């Protein structure tokens, strides 16, 4: 077999794929990561996700995004997409923008991105590209490794990636627990922030060199 | 008396203001410029503005945004805010993104920006900052010179700037022709693209040095 187990998370095996470019693959469900969307979090459950999923916004521990000097979530400004909403962070970021800016983070609503579990990146660096495939519908999309999830879970990506895969994109009730999504990651492919046009083109180039979606469909029968 | 006429458009006198930092001021209505908003234009009147307001989207003269090699408007991709909508352009732009990207242009929905009439920039360069004041309500906001309008009209700005001034922000039916908006432009203040946090902070410093909003309110009685 061209596939060799390199890792396993929550019952999902991750396989190294023989050949160039270097890649690994796994079949999992698809939870919705709204992190980075500028409407994900707001006071009093005003966002698309529950405020409490970012922590305590009243001077306790807030982990959902950047905080001020007193530990309160940053509120978006009049020049930000959703004034008064909190700034939701992703692990991948655009260095052009300050820590307190929604523009620093990857907008889950518009950018197809995958989540990898913490300590299970398997050599991938934030910004690396991937091909993502819904085996139930045939839908597929290129994506970046854009966020880090719990080390104990696997199979998660952005609101826009869900839309592209025809998976329910609602942050509260969406996603699927059915293991219908095949993710092919290209570790070492980018490793930095770049424009979506640039990384999408690169994902296309790597996928063609790797053997295309047709090869992924063939390999997916082993998963 | 601190004001000296430097220009006139559509019956609106534009005045330089004595002292540093250099500035000019005018009192005008506020038309809505949806250019740069990624939902402004789409085929078949799908955008927030009428498609015809961008020109001819059937291979003819299209001024609404970039076109392909055949002359038809560029459509947004799966990694753009509104896939399938046209790319709407502003005169001011972010050089980090390609001509065909909505991210290159100033998103009217989120960025407070003013329009100056073509051939009537009066020394201002795109990216320069301004203080904008609704004399009827007292609302005010800093903004950038973001787009170029018809040479025969004056008083126009972005959807977000309308929101900040509590003026109807609808691209089709909004804005006002009542001369209630006082715009104080700082020519030579920035003259390039930079993050909103940077230019907004600089506008705040220039306004402090210039004498604050209270000075603009007093000067507005001469307009």
Author numbering:
A (entry chain A), B (entry chain B): 2 to 224
What did the study's authors say about this model?
The structure consisted of two non-contiguous structural domains. Our rigorous analyses not only resulted in a crystal structure of a soil viral AMG product, but also enabled us to propose the mode of action of this previously uncharacterized chitosanase enzyme in the GH75 family of glycosyl hydrolases.
The apo2 crystal form was solved by molecular replacement using the refined apo1 structure as the search model, and refined with phenix.refine. This is consistent with the observation that V-Csn exists as a dimer in solution based on size exclusion chromatography, although there is no evidence that dimerization is required for enzyme activity. Formation of the dimer buries 1830 Å2 (∼9%) of the surface per monomer. The regions of contact involve the loop between β-strands β4 and β5 (in Domain-2) in one molecule slotting between helices α3 and α4 in the second molecule, linked via hydrogen bonding and hydrophobic interactions with residues from the two helices and strand β8.
